[PDB]
Structures are given as C-alpha cells and as structure tokens.
Amino acid sequence: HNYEDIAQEFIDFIYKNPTTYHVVSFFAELLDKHNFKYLSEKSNWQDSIGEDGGKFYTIRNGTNLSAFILGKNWRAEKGVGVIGSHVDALTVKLKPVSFKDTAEGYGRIAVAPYGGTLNELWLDRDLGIGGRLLYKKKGTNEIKSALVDSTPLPVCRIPSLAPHFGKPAEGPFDKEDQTIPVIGFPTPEPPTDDEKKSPLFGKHCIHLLRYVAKLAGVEVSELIQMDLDLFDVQKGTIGGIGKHFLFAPRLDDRLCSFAAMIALICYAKDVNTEESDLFSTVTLYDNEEIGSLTRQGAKGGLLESVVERSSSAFTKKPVDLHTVWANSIILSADVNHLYNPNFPEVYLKNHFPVPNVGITLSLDPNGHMATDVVGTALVEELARRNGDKVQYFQIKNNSRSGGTIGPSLASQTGARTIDLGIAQLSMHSIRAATGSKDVGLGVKFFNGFFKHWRSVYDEF
Amino acid sequence: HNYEDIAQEFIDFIYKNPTTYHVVSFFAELLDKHNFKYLSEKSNWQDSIGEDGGKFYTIRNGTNLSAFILGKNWRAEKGVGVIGSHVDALTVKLKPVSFKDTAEGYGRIAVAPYGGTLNELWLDRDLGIGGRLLYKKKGTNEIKSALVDSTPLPVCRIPSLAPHFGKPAEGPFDKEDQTIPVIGFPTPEPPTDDEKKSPLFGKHCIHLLRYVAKLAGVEVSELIQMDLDLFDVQKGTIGGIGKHFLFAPRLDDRLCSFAAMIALICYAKDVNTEESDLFSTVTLYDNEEIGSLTRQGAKGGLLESVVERSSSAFTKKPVDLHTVWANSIILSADVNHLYNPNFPEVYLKNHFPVPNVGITLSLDPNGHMATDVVGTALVEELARRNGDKVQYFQIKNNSRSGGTIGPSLASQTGARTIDLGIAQLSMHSIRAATGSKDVGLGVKFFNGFFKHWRSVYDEF
Amino acid sequence: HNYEDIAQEFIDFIYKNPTTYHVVSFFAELLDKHNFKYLSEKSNWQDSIGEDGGKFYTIRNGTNLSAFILGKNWRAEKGVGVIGSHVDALTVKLKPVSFKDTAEGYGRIAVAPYGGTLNELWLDRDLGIGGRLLYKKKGTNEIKSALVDSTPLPVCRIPSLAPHFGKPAEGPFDKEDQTIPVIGFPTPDNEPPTDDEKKSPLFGKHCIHLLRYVAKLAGVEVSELIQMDLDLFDVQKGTIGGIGKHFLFAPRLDDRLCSFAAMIALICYAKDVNTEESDLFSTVTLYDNEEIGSLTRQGAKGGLLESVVERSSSAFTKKPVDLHTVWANSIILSADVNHLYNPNFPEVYLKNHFPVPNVGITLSLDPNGHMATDVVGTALVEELARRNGDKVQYFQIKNNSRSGGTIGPSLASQTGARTIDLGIAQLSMHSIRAATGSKDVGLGVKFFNGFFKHWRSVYDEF
Ligand SMILES: [Zn+2]
Ligand SMILES: [Zn+2]
Ligand SMILES: [Zn+2]
Ligand SMILES: [Zn+2]
Ligand SMILES: [Zn+2]
Ligand SMILES: [Zn+2]
C-alpha cells in the first residue's frame, strides 16, 4: 500500500507541476513544510547559518534548487553525502515572439524545441501551456513573477497530416514549418489602449496575453515577459493488466528528482542537527537536456557554492574544501534504460534492468558515466546492508551512450561520483513508463543512502 | 449550449464504446429507448411489419446496423431517404493466438493491425482492451456473447525505443517484430484443471483469460472464442485556447455515425408513421477501413435487404424496387479532411473545409466519390432551406484520394448518392480532432435532410 | 487403409483430369452415378424440381458446377449448408493463334500464362496438351464439344538455357520471348495440307500437325474443327513420397485438392440422405477463374450459387421464399488451400498460426479482409470439429508479410451469409508440382462430411 500511495503522489506531482518552475516551486513548498529554511543566493549567509547548523535550501534562476542538512558536529573529514539530479525535461518553448498571422483562419503559435521534441511522438497530443510570467503592477517599478498552468485545458495540438495524402504525410517532419501548434480558429474584442501598453503587445496574440494574464490574475498591460512551455496534459496512470507499470510524461529526470527529495525529507524527519555530524544534500539542476553549461545547470556549480558558503558561515575555523570533497560521495541520479523486449538487439546481456526490482547502476568505460570500481562496491555494500537490490546498465560495444551530469560534478568537486537511477522505458518520449513500484523502491534506496553512506564509505 | 452538450455526449459516446461491437450496442439501446423495434435477420419479417409501417432496426454480425422508419402511406415513387456511414475504425486486433512467451520477464501479446495502425502515432499510448467474447455456460451447449472493456485501465502499451540508442530508434518500425504491446511483468497462480477446459487455454495467457472472464462475469472454462481490440483509453476533450476544438480517438467514422443516428432519433420524435409517406433510414456498416467487401460491410447489402424485406412485408401488392431506388437519395456520410495549416501544399484552394462551419461535400471527378452535379445542387438547396452552411473538399490534381462506401452504395442500388461528411484533422491518427461545434452542426444538417430531402428532390 | 486409398484416388483424379473441363466432367459423371439429376441453366426449373426436392446439379460454361441436395421438408429458416471451391488451376493456354514459323527447324507453339506460370518452375517439365474442342460434323450446322488429352505423351517442353552460356541463362525469363514451348523438329518426310483440312476455320491458326493430332484424339476430321481452348500442363503423375510416405506430391493441388475432398464428402453424405425426410439444403459449388480474380460469369462473382438457391427455392414450393432469411441462416465454407509451414522459410510464417501435415483442416484467418472468417465462424468450426473428432489448425500472415486471397469475401458479400475461409494446407502453392500430407485428402473429406452432417445442429447453438 505504501508503494501504491507514493506512486500516486508521483503521478499527481508530475500532473500538477508541468514546468521546471512548477517542480522547483513544489519542492520549495515541501521543504518549507518540513522546516527547511530558505536562504537567498543574493545575500551572505554568515549570520543565517550558525554553529548548530540546521536544514536549509536555496534557489537559483527559479529552476536550480539545493536543499541541505548541516549537523552541529560536522567536520571536513566527514565529507558531504550528495544526490544530484535534473529537473528540466524535454519540452516545447514558445518563441520570444510567438505571434503568427492566422492561416486560412487557423490560429497558431511560433515555438521551438527544448531538447529532441517536435517529432512524431509529439503529434496529436493534447498540449497545455504554462510556465513563468514576469509582470509589473501598474503604478510600480517592482518586477514580480507568477506561475501559470492551463491544465486540464489543452490549448494546442500539433496535427499530423492524414496518410491519405501520401508521401507528404510520411515523417520525419520539419520542426519549423510542419510541427506547429494549432491554438484555435476564432470567429468575428480588438486590443484596448491599455492592453497595448504591455511591452509584450504585438509579440504574442492578444488572446494568449489575455489568457495568461487571467490565469495569473494580473492585467495584460502589466505583462513584461514570459517563459512558457507546451506540454502533454494527459495525467499519468498505473497500467498493465497486473498494474505493474506507471505511465507518465516527463519521467526524465523528475522521477529521480522526486524520489531523491522525498527520501531527503523522510530522512530529515529523524535527524536533529544538534546531534548530527553529517552534511547531506539533494541538489536539483536545470538544463541537463541541453548540455548543462549554464549558470543553473550542473556546470554552474550551485552544489560547490552551497558547500563553501555553508562551511564558511558554519564555523570560525577555516574549512579545507579539498578535504571535504575527498571524503564525499555524490550520487548522480538520472534515469537510465529499462530493457525494451521489442528491441533486444540494443541491450547488453547481463547489463540491463527490469521493472520493480530496484535502483540501476549506470556503468560506462568511456567516460559517459562517472561510476568507478570503488563506487560500485560502495553502492552494492549499501544495498546489501539496507535490503535493496541493484541492477546494471551499460551499452553494447557497438551501440552508443547518452550522458549525465555525473562526470561534470565529479570533475568539478574531485569527489567520487556514482551514476545511477531509476530505469524507465521510452526515455525522451512525450509519455514514458517505469515500474509502478520503482518510485517507492527509489525512495527506499536513497533514504538508505543518506542513513548509511558515511558508515559504509568508512570501510574503504 | 446545445452544441456544447451534444459535443460532450459525443465524447462520452466515444469513450464508453471503444469497439465496433460497443458502438452498435450503444445505438441499439438508444433505438430501443426511442421505440424502434428490433427485428432479427434470421426470421421473416412478414408478421413483424404490417400496413401501418413503424420504426424498426436490425443488426448483422453484431457490427452492422440498420434503423428505419416506414410510413403507412409510403409508396415506391417516394423512394428512400438514406444516410450510410461506417462504425468500424482503425484499431489493433488480438491475434487468434495472442500468447507469447515472456521475454526477459516481460509479458506481451501478439496482435495485428486493422487498417493502417501500429505506426509511430500508436507508440507510447495508453491502450485498453475490449470487444466481444463468446462463451458457453458449464453444462450447456448454448453459445452466448458478452462485451468487455478494460477502460480506464490501460492493460498495455507499445514502447518506443529511447533515441539515445541511435538508428535502431528511428522509424518506420516493423509491425510484427517491433510494435508489440507490452502487457506486464509478472512475479512469482498456475492454471487450474477447470481453466484448462477452456478451448482457449494455451491460445492466450491465463492471466488475460482470467481478466476478461472476470470482466464478463463468466468462468475461464466457459470461454470459447473472442474478438478483442486494443485502443486508446484517453478520453476525448474540448481544446484550443478558445475551446474551438474537440480532440478524440476514432472520429473516422463514428463522428458521422453518431451525428446521423442522433439526427434520425430527433427526427423520429416528430414523425407519425400512421400518417407519414416516407421511408427513412440510417445504416451503419462495418469494415469500410478494409475495403467493404464483407457481409457486414457496405457491399454486403444490408441496406438493400432492409428495403426489400420491409417493402415485401409492408403490402400485399408487388413493389418495384427499381422505381424505389430511382426516386431515392443516399447520403454517404464519411468524415473528410479539414484544412491543416501546416501542410497547405496538399489542400486544393477553394476546395477545403474549416472547423465549426458545417457539413462538407466530398467531390471527385475520378470515381472516388459518388457525388454528382444534381446531388451537389440538392444538398446546396437543402442547406439554403435549413439555414445550413456547405463546404467543399476535393483533392489537388497532383494529389491522392481516399475512398468511401459511396460508389458501392450508388452502384448497388442505382440511387443517386452524395458523398459528404463532417471534416476532421488527422484522419486515421490514434487521436484526431474536429471543431467543437461540428457534431452539433452535423446533427442539424442531417436532421434537415430527413425533414426536407423529399420536397427538395421533387424540384428536380 | 481408407486414407491411403482415397489418396490414390485423388492422385488418379488429378492425373486423368488435367484441365478444368475434365475436372468438371469428372464430377458430373460421379454425380450421375450417384443419382444426382442434371439440370440445364437454359431451361426453367419449375417442372424439374418438385416439392419432394431431390439431388441435382447444373453446369455453366463447362467449368462452373453446382451440386445440391434439397430436402422435401426444407424451409427458409434452415438456411443452406455450402462449400465453395475453385476448379481452375494455374496453367498455360494456347493463344487464339498458336501458329509459329519454325525456327532453325524447331516447331514451337505460341502460348500465354493463366495465372503466374511460365516461370522457372515451368522450365524443363514434361508438358501434355488437352482441353475443349468445338467442332461441327460435316454436312451439319450443330456445334458440338469434345475433350482431348495427350497424357501420357508430353508434346511440349520449355527448355532452360544451359548455364554454360552465362548471364543469358540467369532468370527471370521473358514470358513472351523466352519461355516458349518447343513441340517438335519435323523432317521432310507432315504431309502438305489437303483441300479438306483447309476448310477448317482453324486452318492457318494452328500448325496442321497440331490440328491433325487433336482431331485424331477427339475422333473428328480437321475440317470439322471450329475452335478450341487447350492448356499445356505437367503430365508427371502424382506420387506418395517421403521416407515414411508422409507426403503426396502432385500438380494442380490449388484448389482441386479441396474441390475433390468437398465433392467426395458431399457424395458420401448424400448416400445416407433421403430427400423425402430431410429438411436441409446442401451444396458444393465449384468455380472457375479464381486464379484470375473471379470476375467472370463462371467465377464466384458470377453468382451460380445464388442462382441455384433462388431457382431451386422458387420451383420447390408455391409459397414465396424469403431469400434474405435463407442466407441469414446459412453457413458457407469457402474451401481453398492455404499454406503448410515450410521449414526452410521460417521467417515468413507466423508463430502459432501455421499448419503442419496430416493433422486436419486449416482455418484461414485475416483481420484485413483477405478472408471472410469471423469470430462466430471460427467458434462454429471449432465446435463442429470437437463434435466430429476433427482437428483444426490455423493460418494467418505475419504483420510484416503479404496475404493471398480467396472467393470467400465475394461469396459472403454477395449472399450476406456468414462465410468461413479454410482449407487443406499445402506446400509450394502455385508451383507446377506441389505437396501436401498423404493423409490430408482423407482428413479433408472427413471434416467436410462432418460439416454436412452437423453444421445445422451446431449453428443452432448460436
Ligand atoms: Zn534526458
Ligand atoms: Zn536525464
Ligand atoms: Zn478511414
Ligand atoms: Zn471513413
Ligand atoms: Zn491459387
Ligand atoms: Zn486457391
């Protein structure tokens, strides 16, 4: 029943938080409810973090979050127990100017792919709109932001051409000229003088501006800018004749992000920082799907920043960060590939995971993963101590591998990093699948990590 | 308000009746409800239909239905007002033997495409299972039928391969080896001696047998055969930022079938068969998507059978069927193509329809449609009288045309036949779209047809 | 022993009746012997069929036959029990003008393929000639018909080119210029045409040697020959084969295998049927031209079956018969051979959906309209088999494969009756010499016999 319940919570989480902004906001609220104190990056933390340590979190760009627990008795030699995952997922972004003239009466919006989207899997899917709106209340100068979400209303859909037309209906399709979202077909109010005051007037259809303004509860004239996504509004579902699966969009990598954060929360419940000598954290990054080379991506170093700022404010004595990282363990948690029975030729025998068993170690000898022999032994020892099962995933020698933030974090910190994650089918599809038990199994494993990684690594 | 309500009824209709069997059963129930008397094809109608005529309907194969209204004062010269549509839709059929050995633990079922399915649009879609089961209660010899439907449970899904793997993940995909539905991943009850009594034991996984037996409320041993489909369980939805669209699966051709049937029922409410001099009917065919050459398809002649049997039982005097058909008008109602703004190059200027305007006339000079100059004039006159709008659809000279049952019905009866229908986007996709007002506009047009076609045709 | 005997009877049947004309003539003769009364299509049957019903058969074009048994107590609601098969088989037809000048002394005849013949399987095969001759006895105007058959003499052979010549000897070969039957190599001393022979409307259209030969076979004068429809076919007699005699090798199995099995079943069944007591209407209708689409008057689309049932029911009783009710209560078995699993091409056969030799009838299933078989029909055949102690196999194509067709969909659409496509499976369909199980002819007869005996009782359960 526990696994079923957490599976449902995950489904609701995915459904109610479609964009990276919503996901980060969701975790921030969860953290607040569990007494983690928010610290602003733009302020020095010397007086915010005392010698008793505590539970805190910070956010960068509204899409990069780091939650951490610092014990009163922590010292550099104890290192840091880290779980890094990414909260961005393949999606479709409205262009800076999404406005398009009507085509034979059809209303459409100009968009661009974020990652490998706008392909055949994105055709004929109900797409909602949502994201971040920047506005300036009339009469003021302060710029504020609001999050909007059309769910359950699918405002647009990219229409496939009927096969009846022949060759023109065969893919692949041009992402600029053919995979364009259709948003409506209006029939014969004109822009008001006040609406025309918006810096966005003309850059987006007045109907769209009025719609998002209404969702945010502000005036069109107050809209300053926006960063909106188009996403599948179909709610996730437990599937399979025996209910062995969970079908849902954007699993990569909110599946691991969710599991890691919930594990951190469950773990934190029994941790009193006044009697703890550990430093634990779950850091969630944006932009992994586009290379991670952005200030809000893994290469932006929020993790390193949090550890340095915290250790500096924490004690009056200098902290040797090189010693800290040398004694740390970073779990780069990113979903990997579940065996797909219909494509046996691309999976390496003895090196593929199956549903509802446990976390999957990502192994690669050519640098695609940071996992090493010691890290592998550590995870397997951990699992043995906690009653967890560990699976493997490595590509066939004649295949190719995707990447993760693992190597970046390992190189940037110098800390042993282990790439692993909850395996899923159809990675990067608009609607993927994993085991109905995998969310709970993932939480269990990550919870065990925070509880016992230090004692286990001591044996090495 | 009426348009919004009928649009919602249509959505519910599609969702609650996934297979052709369900659709026919739905209409039969609706007809019983509106006082149409069911007549079995296996019995002579001489003592079921008399001088007073009345409202009746019959069914063939459980997938071919004909509803008709015969007035006491009808005569051969009055002809027959007909609307013919098809109730079969592209789907996926379980094979005679759907059993497949588990593959690395994964449960899969052997299926075959009905029409052009099992393509990329069918990948990563939540698929439910349903259809007709034939069973024989223990200790008896009688064979009975039962309809089952897993909705909302999606028992399977055809998993796309992650793009990370390269070329192997690029379509098109083999319909036999790559697009196979995954139904589960079982963990370690063995078949019982009684379950093995089923003629289907071994032909389908015992898990699937137990599941459909449970849905039908019968024992596994009692199952002797089945005709099941796999279909999208995502309920339809009104979409577009201005709610101008309706997104739903299996629109072709249940959209016209529903509109025509509802129009008949609305029309019948005010028809007094004791006074009426008309003979009206809506006949729904199976197998249009596979050529119509089956006994339950248009070429099977149920329409002609209904008219001959009815006219024979109706009066003691001989009825000249050639005169009947010479004075008849057949509307071959099959969905046609809405202009898709992203593929302007395949639509003929001045010969394409748009959403929420009205019925679309299907025109073709090379025999793909039966529509002629007189039929076109008749529909346009009919529309002018009822306050309906009429659109056009014809292919570009350098394009390709789909087909309909139109030419078959016209040739088989000798009656002037007009091909038309409610236009839709993405015909044959697993999830298509049409205007949110189009179901209502369609009903309005067809209602007008039954009411005024005789008076209009008289002018010619 | 019974299976072995019937297997031999089948082999003899195939060997002694090479063309569609011979096959129909063979069955007509068998029906006559078993007291089935012949009825001409050209005369009204009102006075030929009485209320006592009876056993009859009719023929159209000499290549389309329908045999039926009508019970005195039959009524529309009882429907009709039908087995439909085709008697035409892939062959080679002499052209309207088969004459060809000698080539370096070689005599050849101009021919055309009927279906997919004249390929590599037809090369280096001993070919006999036979078929229908139309003639008019000297001094008269009446046109008569005669059937001829050169068997065992193979008058023709299409010679493969020795591989020594290289590329030119590699197929495929042009059906008009390369696959031409060689009929002889004459020498001076074949006499010149006599004045009487030149009187034949066929003189000049076919070499005099051929005209004299077929005239001799028929027992008429060359001058009396007016027209002809002749085939070239393999004269190699069928044989029981396999180290354990598990197989039967023979030409033209598609679809004379099912046609023979169905007719024998009908005759065996008819032996115990007394029309004075019976309330059934049973028939085996054999069609021509299935191999070319069936759209001819003698093919399935020509409607001989529908005609027989309408004409019979009309002559049978004074009361009106509702044909729609008749067909709604009927079951049609479209019996056409399907594919036996070929172990050397496992990649084209669908797992769990292919038949093997010597087991039983094979149900032909297809979800895209190639077969008329449906869920109720499948259940009916399986129930029917369980009752008669017959085994039922399955055949359906892989999703990425291709399917052939049958007359099934045509018969179902034309009548409106539930139709089931099935048949005796064979290897190498459309080859000049195919193969099936040595027990399959017998198993087929057994199944079809069971169909006529119990289909009505079984269909009642639905
Ligand atoms: Zn990814
Ligand atoms: Zn990822
Ligand atoms: Zn269609
Ligand atoms: Zn259609
Ligand atoms: Zn054939
Ligand atoms: Zn055949």
For chain C, the structural domain boundaries read 1-89+237-462, 90-236
- Inspect the interface and report whether the beta carbons of A161 and B402 lie closer than 8 Å: no
Question: Environment class of residue C29 by beta-carbon count within 10 Å: exposed (0-12), middle (13-18) or buried (19+)?
Answer: exposed
- Experimental structure resolution, Å: 1.8
Compute the distance from residue C256 Cα to the ligand 6 centre, in Å: 8
Cβ-defined contact of B156 to A237 (cutoff 8 Å): no
Binding partners of C (≥3 Cβ pairs within 8 A): B
Q: Tell me the C-alpha distance between C96 and C88, whole Å.
A: 19
Task: Report the DSSP pairing between strands B54-60 and B37-38.
Answer: parallel
Q: Which among B45, B177, B224 has CB closest to C379?
A: B224
Q: Residue B306: phi, psi to the nearest 5?
A: -55, -45
Q: Are A270 and A438 in contact (CB under 8 A)?
A: no
Breaks, C-N > 2.5 A, in chain A lie after: 188
CB B371 within 8 A of CB B338: no
- Nearest-ligand number for the alpha carbon of B298: 4
Query: Considering CB atoms only, which of B123, B168, B183 is closest to A345?
Result: B168
Contacts with C301 from chain B: Cβ below 8 Å: none
Closest among C298, C287, C251 to C430, alpha carbons compared:
C251
Q: What are the residue ranges of helices labelled H in B220-320?
A: 251-268, 302-314
Find the farthest-apart pair of alpha carbons in chain B and give their distance in angstroms, rounded: 75
Interior/surface letters A186-204, b for 16+ CB within 10 angstroms, e for the rest: eeeeeeeeebeebebbebb
Among B155, B166, B185, whose Cβ lies nearest the Cβ of A354?
B185
CA atoms within 13 A on the CB side of C179: 24
- Cβ-count burial of C391 within 10 angstroms (0-12 exposed, 13-18 middle, 19+ buried)? middle
Please answer yes or no on whether B95 and C350 come within 8 Å at the CB atom: yes
Phi-psi region of C416 (alpha: psi -120 to 50; beta: other; left: phi over 0): left
Alpha-carbon torsion angle C233, C234, C235, C237, nearest 10:
-130
Closest CA relative to residue C111, chosen from C88, C127, C124, C126: C127
Measured between alpha carbons, how far is B388 from B443 in angstroms, rounded to an integer? Answer: 11
What fold characterizes domain A1-89+235-460? Aminopeptidase (3.40.630)
Name the minimum distance, in Å, from the CA of C342 to any CA of chain B: 19
Given a contact cutoff of 8 angstroms between Cβ atoms, the answer to whether A296 and A66 are in contact is no
For domain C1-89+237-462, give the CATH number. 3.40.630.10
Give yes or no on whether A1-89+235-460 and A90-234 have one common fold. Answer: no
Q: How would CATH label the architecture of A90-234?
A: Roll (2.30)
Contact A107 B241 (CB under 8 A): yes
Using CA atoms, how far apart are residues B44 and A208, in angstroms rounded to an integer? 62
Q: Which helix (H) or strand (E) holds B118?
A: none
Ordered DSSP codes for A248-292: ES-HHHHHHHHHHHHHHHHHHHT--GGG---EEEEEEES-GGGTS
Peptide bond into B270 cis (omega under 30): no
Q: Cβ–Cβ of B431/A124 closer than 8 Å?
A: yes
Q: How far is CA B173 from CA A178, A241, B107, B207, B309, in A?
A: 22, 25, 20, 28, 48
Q: How far is CA B317 from CA A269, B78, B311, B314, in A?
A: 91, 16, 9, 9
- Residue B77 half-sphere exposure, CB side, CA atoms within 13 Å? 3
**CA closest to B143 among chain C residues:** C462
Query: What's the A115 CA to ligand 1 centre distance in angstroms?
Result: 8
CA pseudo-torsion sign B229, B234, B236, B242: negative
DSSP B101: -
Q: Give residue B227 CA to ligand 3 midpoint distance, Å.
A: 20
Residue B58 has φ and ψ, to the nearest 5°, of: -140, 165
Give the Cα separation of C235 and A281 in Å (integer): 88
Whether residue C379 and residue B300 make contact (CB cut-off 8 A), yes or no, is: no
B contacts of A153 (beta carbons < 8 Å): 239, 241, 243
Neighbours of C241 (CB within 10 A): 14
Could you tell me which chain B residue has the CA closest to the CA of A401? B164
Residue appearing with tokens 């190189």? A411
Of A237, A241, A339, the CB nearest to B184: A241
Q: Encoding tokens for residue B430?
A: 């697993």
Residues of chain C found within 8 Å of residue B45, distances taken between Cβ atoms: 322
Strands B111-114 and B64-70: unpaired
- HSE-CB of C282 using CA atoms within 13 angstroms: 28
> How far, in Å, is the centroid of ligand 1 from the Cα of A253?
7
Dist. CA C146–CA C160, nearest whole Å: 33
Measured CA angle at C172 (ends C171, C174), to 5 deg: 115
Fill in the amino acid letter for A85: S
Q: Output DSSP code: residue A367.
A: S
Q: What is the DSSP pairing of strand C239-241 with strand C425-426?
A: unpaired
Distance separating the N- and C-terminal Cα atoms of chain B = 37
Burial tier of B452 (Cβ tally within 10 Å: 0-12, 13-18, 19+) = middle
Q: Which CATH number fits domain C90-236: 3.40.50.1820, 3.30.565.10, 2.30.250.10, 3.30.1280.10?
A: 2.30.250.10
Tell me whether residues C352 and B110 touch, CB distance under 8 A: yes
Containing H/E element for A100?
A: none
Burial A287-303 (b: 16+ CB within 10 A, else e): bbbeebebebbbbbbbb
Q: Which chains touch B (3 or more CB pairs under 8 A)?
A: A, C
On chain A, the residues whose CB falls within 8 A of the CB of B425 are: 159, 182
C24 neighbors C261 (Cβ within 8 angstroms): no
Q: How was this structure determined?
A: X-ray
- Read off φ and ψ for residue C4, nearest 5 degrees: -65, -45
Q: How far is Cα B7 from Cα B411, in angstroms, rounded to an integer?
A: 34
Q: Was C197 annotated as part of a binding site?
A: no
- Identify the three-state secondary structure at position A158: coil
Cβ contacts (< 8 Å) between A169 and chain B: which residues?
A: 343
Smallest Cβ–Cβ distance between B343 and the set A108, A178, A431 belongs to A178
CB-CB neighbours of B385 under 10 Å: 13
Q: Give the C-alpha separation, B128 to B132, whole Å.
A: 14
**Other residues' Cβ atoms within 10 Å of the Cβ of residue C230:** 25
How far away is chain B from the Cα of C447, in angstroms, using its nearest Cα?
19
